[PDB]
Structure formats: C-alpha cells, structure tokens
Amino acid sequence: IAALVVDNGSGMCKAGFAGDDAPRAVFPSIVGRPRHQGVMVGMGQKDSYVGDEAQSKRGILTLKYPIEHGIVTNWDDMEKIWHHTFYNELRVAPEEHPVLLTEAPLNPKANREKMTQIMFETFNTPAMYVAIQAVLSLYASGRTTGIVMDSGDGVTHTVPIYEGYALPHAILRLDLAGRDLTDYLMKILTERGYSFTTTAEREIVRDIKEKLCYVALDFEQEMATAASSSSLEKSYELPDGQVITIGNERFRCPEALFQPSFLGMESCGIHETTFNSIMKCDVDIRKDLYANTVLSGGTTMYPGIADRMQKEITALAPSTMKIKIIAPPERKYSVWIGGSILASLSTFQQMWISKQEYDESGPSIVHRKCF
Amino acid sequence: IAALVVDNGSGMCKAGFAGDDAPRAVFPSIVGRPRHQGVMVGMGQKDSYVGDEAQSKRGILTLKYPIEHGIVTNWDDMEKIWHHTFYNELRVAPEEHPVLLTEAPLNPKANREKMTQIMFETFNTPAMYVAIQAVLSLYASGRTTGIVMDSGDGVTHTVPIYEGYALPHAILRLDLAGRDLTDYLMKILTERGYSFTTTAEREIVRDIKEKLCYVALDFEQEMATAASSSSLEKSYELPDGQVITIGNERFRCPEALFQPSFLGMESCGIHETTFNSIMKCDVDIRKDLYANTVLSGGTTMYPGIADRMQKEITALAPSTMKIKIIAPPERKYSVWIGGSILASLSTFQQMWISKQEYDESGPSIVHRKCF
Amino acid sequence: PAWXAXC
Amino acid sequence: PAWXAXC
Amino acid sequence: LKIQVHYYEDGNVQLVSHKDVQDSVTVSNEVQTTKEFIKIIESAENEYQTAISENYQTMSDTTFKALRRQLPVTRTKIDWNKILSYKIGK
Numbered sequence A, B: 001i002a003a004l005v006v007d008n009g010s011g012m013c014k015a016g017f018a019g020d021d022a023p024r025a026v027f028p029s030i031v032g033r034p035r036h037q038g039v040m041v042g043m044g045q046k047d048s049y050v051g052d053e054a055q056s057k058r059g060i061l062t063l064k065y066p067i068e069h070g071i072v073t074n075w076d077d078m079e080k081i082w083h084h085t086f087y088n089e090l091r092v093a094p095e096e097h098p099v100l101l102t103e104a105p106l107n108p109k110a111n112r113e114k115m116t117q118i119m120f121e122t123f124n125t126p127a128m129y130v131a132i133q134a135v136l137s138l139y140a141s142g143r144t145t146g147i148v149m150d151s152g153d154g155v156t157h158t159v160p161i162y163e164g165y166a167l168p169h170a171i172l173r174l175d176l177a178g179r180d181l182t183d184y185l186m187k188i189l190t191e192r193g194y195s196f197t198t199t200a201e202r203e204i205v206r207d208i209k210e211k212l213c214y215v216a217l218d219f220e221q222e223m224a225t226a227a228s229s230s231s232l233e234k235s236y237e238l239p240d241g242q243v244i245t246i247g248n249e250r251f252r253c254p255e256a257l258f259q260p261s262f263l264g265m266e267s268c269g270i271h272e273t274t275f276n277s278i279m280k281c282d283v284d285i286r287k288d289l290y291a292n293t294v295l296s297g298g299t300t301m302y303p304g305i306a307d308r309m310q311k312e313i314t315a316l317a318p319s320t321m322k323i324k325i326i327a328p329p330e331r332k333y334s335v336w337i338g339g340s341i342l343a344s345l346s347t348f349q350q351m352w353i354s355k356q357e358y359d360e361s362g363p364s365i366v367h368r369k370c371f
Numbered sequence C, D: 001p002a003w004x005a006x007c
Numbered sequence E: 001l002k003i004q005v006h007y008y009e010d011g012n013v014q015l016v017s018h019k020d021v022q023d024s025v026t027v028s029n030e031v032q033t034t035k036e037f038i039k040i041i042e043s044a045e046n047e048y049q050t051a052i053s054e055n056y057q058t059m060s061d062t063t064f065k066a067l068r069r070q071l072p073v074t075r076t077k078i079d080w081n082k083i084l085s086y087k088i089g090k
C-alpha cells in the first residue's frame, strides 16, 4: 500500500500519495461558514464549505484559516480540512494507508500531540510520522548539506542541515510571513484609497500580491524612480470588473521581508536571520552552507527575491565566499515533493510510528521523536 | 574627598561611594532608543533612555546592551551609561571624587586605554584605578585565598586567588552567562506555547528567570517526579494579566550551566571550569583552594545551586580533599562590595593614578603594566 | 463606496 | 493570538 | 632551537619541537656585533615562544578537532534510537 503525504501549510494544503512527483490536491486551507440566513431551502445548503468550495462561494461566506503561524488554532475546522483532504480531495480511507505529516520548526508540543491524537483516533491511521518541513525542503533539491530559508503564508524559518542531520540549536523562526505581507499590502493599498476589509476582500488582496508585487533589488533608487516616473506602476481588475493601480506599493510590500520595522516588528529581516543562523553554525561548516542556501515555500516566489537575498547576504558574509542562492522553480511545492521522495524509501520505512505503539505507549513515543 | 566605586558588569551597573556595604545605584546597563515616532511633542521626549527609565518605557524602545558577552561593543553607548551614572543615578559631578572602575581579566589591552581616556578626558576624574573584578569578590568574602566562580550576565570567570593575588595562567574565561541562559529559557517556554521575540520581550523573560527557575540536585529523578505529578508546577502572570503555567521548565533551564551541551556550547560547565582551573595551580595550594570555593555574581542565586555544585565538583576532585562551597546571601554584590573595601584603604588612597599623572603621561601609563 | 474601490 | 502568549 | 616537555601525573603528555634558522649579517664594531647577535636571538626565541603559546592555544584546538571532534557536526549529543534506525542520506 502507498503511504499518504500531507503538507499542512498555513495557507494552502498540498497532499498526495507517496511517489507522486507533485501533489495531487493543492487547495487553500480555508473553512467557511455563511454570513447570512439561508432562504431558498430547496437548494439544500451545507453548513461549512472547505477549500476551493469556500473560494468559489466567497462573498456569502466568512472565511477562517484554522492554522496561524503553524499553530492549529481551531481543531474542528482543521479536522474538517483533513476529512476533505482524505474522503474527497484524494478519495482514500486514511485508516488503510500510512500517513506523513509535515510540521513547522519550533512549534509547541501540544500541536504535535493533538495532530497525533486526531490522526490515530479520528482517522485511525495505521502508521505515521511528523517531519520537520526544512528537512524535506533540502531533500527536495537532492542535496544533503545546506541551510534552508523556508517562508510560507504563516512561518519563515532557517534550518542548517549537514550530511542530512539538522542542527537543532542553530534553528531560527521569524513569524513575518505571507499573511503578514498580505496585511501590510492592505494598509499600503489604502493610501491610494483602495480599501479592503472583509475576509473576501482579503483574498482579493492576496491575489493582487501574487501577481503585481516584486522584490526590488535596490530600494532607494527604485523608490526615487517611483517618485520621478509613472512607468514603474501598472494595473489589475477586481472580481467586480473595476481596475486598480499598484505602484510604489508593488515593491514596498515585499521590502518588508528585509525590513520588518515596516510592520513594526523589531525582528531581523530574512537576510539577517539566514546570516545569524549561519553564524550560529560551527566555524568550519559556514562555507559549505554558503554554497547551499535553499529557498522554499510560496512567499519565496517573489520575482527578484533570489537576487536580493544574494546581494544582501553578500554584505553580511566576509569577502571571498561563494555566496550562491539556490532558488529553483518548484520551490512552490518543494516541501511536499521532499516528502514524497523520503516516503518512498526503506530506510524511512523504519521511522513510521505504528498505531499499536502509540496505542500502548500513549503520547510518550511522540514526546521523543519531536526532539 | 571620598572615592566612587563603579562595577562595569554586563547586565547591571553597580555604583556608589567607598566604605558603604551596599551600592547607592543599581540599574540595567541598557541604552534604549525609540522604536516609533514621538507624536505628542509636549512630552519633551529623549533621543535615548537608560536604566529604570528605559525599563519603565520598555514597550516603546529598542533596548541595546553596550556590553555583549563581556566586551564593550559601542563606546558612546557605554559613555552614556557612565554619564547617567554620575549625573543622574548618583547626582554628582565626576570631576570631584576619586573613581574606581572594575575590569575583567584577559580583556585586551586597548580597552584599558579607552576606559582610562574616557574617565580622565570625558569625566575629569581627579584620580583613577582599574581593578580585576574577581579579586574584589574574595576580598569581600573576607578570605585571603580561594577559587572564585563569578558569573553575571556576560562572562563566567574562574580565578584561583592565592596570597591575595590572581594567578593569571589559571584564569578560565567562560562565555556562558546570564544572557545566554535567558535565551534558553525562551526556547523551553516555546515548547509549551509561550512566545517572546522583541528585545523588550527578552527583558520580560529575564524577570521570569529570576523567579520560577531553580537547580535540582539530581536531574532525571526530579524530572521523573515532575513528569508523574503536577505538584511541581507554579505560575507568574505577564504585564498583560494572563498566567503562564510552568513545571518541568523550572529545573531544565539552569541545568544548562552543568550541561553546555544543551546549548551546543563546546566549552565545559560551571563546576568543570572550576575544577579545570584548580588543577592548573601550584600543587601545594590544591587543598588550600578546595576548602575555599567562592560563588558570586547574579547568576549564582538559583535555589539548590550550591548543593548541586558540591555534589557535582565532588565527582571531579579526588575524594577527602574537603571541598566546601561559600554561598551565603548578599553574594549578588560581592564584587562591588570588595571595591568599596579596597577604596577604604589608606594605602590605596596613595596608589591611584592621579589626574596630574595622566595629564603628564597620557594613556602610556598602562604600557608599563600591559606588556 | 466612498473610497475608490472597496467601500 | 495563536501563540498562547504572544501571537 | 629545541623544546622538550613531559607530564605524567596520571596519564602522559609530551611536547617535542625544533626550529632551524639561517641568516646574513654585516660586521662593523665589537659593540654592534654583540648587540646584533643578541637582537637576533631575542627576536627568534620570543617569536618562537609567541607562536608556541598563542598559535597552539587556538590553532591546535582546530587541527586536533579536525582529527577528532569535541561535539559532532550537529553540535548535539547523538541519540541512539535515531542512530540505529536512520541511515541518513548520502
């Protein structure tokens, strides 16, 4: 039987069977409910739409993300996401196949506990493992020594991993993520009088970000150009047909990854957290990391972010280093791909916790393997 | 005129006139700058704040320590700490009283010049001296021989002082201290779902470290008890009124002082660096030292730390050497206390570098001493 | 409706 | 807000 | 120039070393040659001691580490369950 691989991303759920080269199910991790009383009873409405359903019916629903910064905040909402993942999106009985769960680094013990409990007892999975997302990210490029800079909708994190072993004390988390950049995008679009408030409107702003924002290579000269010619500014049209112009705002939004001060976060920028994790690594190995900075997760998709990460972390490194930013295509779903790779293998076939083990030993098996 | 005694500690600056048995000023050595714009211009708001003003204003300031690990990082920030010490904390003109500066052993020779030049040329001190911290500690403890284990916010220092002299060859500077220990508390709190990131938030964690945390006499026995029963669990509520619930974390943090492995530190633990220092001595003085183990500086305060230190270092020494741990109260301040005594000696009143001596010799006064 | 798009 | 005492 | 040290309190450690020096000089006066030869001896012995203290207290830690490490590449103590089970990738 083929194990099931699920990337529990904060914004989108990527899932499939082991050995697929790309995820089968790729959908926004949304649970919806209706904002108004239902009146055409002959329609036969259902009380909570999920995934692409909620995104289809958008403006009659309140939209809930159950995962905030990797923390599962609402469990019955997340349980419905997994129910839909299994019975509808993949069409499989999860009690008959082993399951691979991705998880974010430095995420509290209880999240793994409740994930475990729900898998082993709501879905009765037969065997299971929970992988540190960055491991899978590095593995996805086929390399086995580097530092990963992961940056999803909910978490940005830096993990050094050498000869395939992680450095746990040298990990960093920064919660400034894709949602936060959507937040700041609202605020700056408000300057040109484009207000967006409802969750539905939030999704419009997410769409806008995903197609007109880009990482400026040279912020000062760019912003001087933006104050000198309209040629850097362009437009997009709403689901309401009307056009909206995105301008200075284009670059100002993604600039925040390097300047978290712009969202009033004192926390260091992504170039600083990568550097500050390399400098937490043992003095020997820093070279091996500089040739192997791998980017992963969807907010690493901004045009020019690689160029900026390079030209920035260049300044943080000493001169005479091969500072090479590994930013391929498929970085989008890389984490999942790595899951599928690792899942296919007899060595990893030792790692999966048997349901029976958990059943007999309680949470005491997972309380170890979470490190 | 009476002398002024100043302790340039990593975390808190302890200061006051000589002969006194408690310092007249005790404050966190912080330069705190604005995080945000001062819109209410009528406040008379400051370019930076210091000490208890910064700690009151915590929520709106970027808190920078000018000493990190043990070295001054930015001279003008330290210079502000000193200016504030004189004019605000003590309300005195530094031109008018002799001055003593504490200093760490093996601090590079140029630092002595910078301190000396600032104290004469910025602050016009009428006489000056610079002293090895650790000496003052034993001196304050009365005894004329022993091994110091001094640990504040930045450096753990071990010195065997014999016939009233530091033995320089035996001095084991250890980069593990209070600040480093604070970081690890952040992580073990994270396990249970509490988060803290901003440099303001760091100081909140410091308050917790100084209250709930303690040293267990034997690690897994205690931990097994804690894993069995919630009896070992206590609480402390943040400025935002929510209680934190804490058990297993309480002994786990300061365990690190015995296990630098927990933080990936290559250097040995606190008992270890003490032994490892003892063994370097002229062999005849070994027993003179073992009866004379002296603890000091703020990190030495944790409940059970002395009893643990005894059971720990007893393993390393050959038995029947009668190892004894001097750890009464008031050891929070032994270093500054020592200087206050030293500055009361009539011979020392002859021995200061005078203002007139520096005004003829400049910083070259130290070149006879520094080799 | 007061703003440009949006309300 | 996610976090138990922080976000 | 040669140095030899032995310690044996419980186990044993030994230091063994040589340096060879070649130089060229010019001859002027009895006082000046006296001073000059001494200056060379002074310089050579003080540099030789300076290297053998200051370099060996740091660089020997790094080369001895390159022969066997103090903590692993992970900077963590190894874990027997994961070490038995996980033949981690090439």
Ligand SMILES: Nc1ncnc2c1ncn2[C@@H]1O[C@H](COP(=O)(O)OP(=O)(O)O)[C@@H](O)[C@H]1O
Pocket: A008, A009, A010, A011, A012, A013, A151, A152, A153, A154, A178, A179, A206, A209, A210, A211, A297, A298, A299, A300, A301, A302, A303, A332, A333
């Ligand atoms: N073309 C794009 N440019 C910038 N950001 C993007 C782009 N496409 C997707 N994203 C961001 O990727 C984030 C989610 O990526 P992903 O890692 O797949 O989901 P999750 O973060 O939940 O695991 C979203 O917040 C979205 O803003």
Ligand SMILES: Nc1ncnc2c1ncn2[C@@H]1O[C@H](COP(=O)(O)OP(=O)(O)O)[C@@H](O)[C@H]1O
Pocket: B007, B008, B009, B010, B011, B012, B013, B151, B152, B153, B154, B178, B179, B206, B209, B210, B211, B296, B297, B298, B299, B300, B301, B302, B332
């Ligand atoms: N009662 C206590 N419990 C735990 N930690 C303490 C206590 N008192 C002081 N400390 C720690 O000692 C550190 C500073 O020690 P101290 O030697 O007084 O400062 P410095 O070395 O800068 O002079 C602080 O970071 C503080 O966390």
Ligand SMILES: [Mg+2]
Pocket: A008, A009, A010, A152, A153, A297, A298, A335
């Ligand atoms: Mg993700």
Ligand SMILES: [Mg+2]
Pocket: B008, B009, B010, B133, B151, B152, B153, B297, B335
């Ligand atoms: Mg001190």
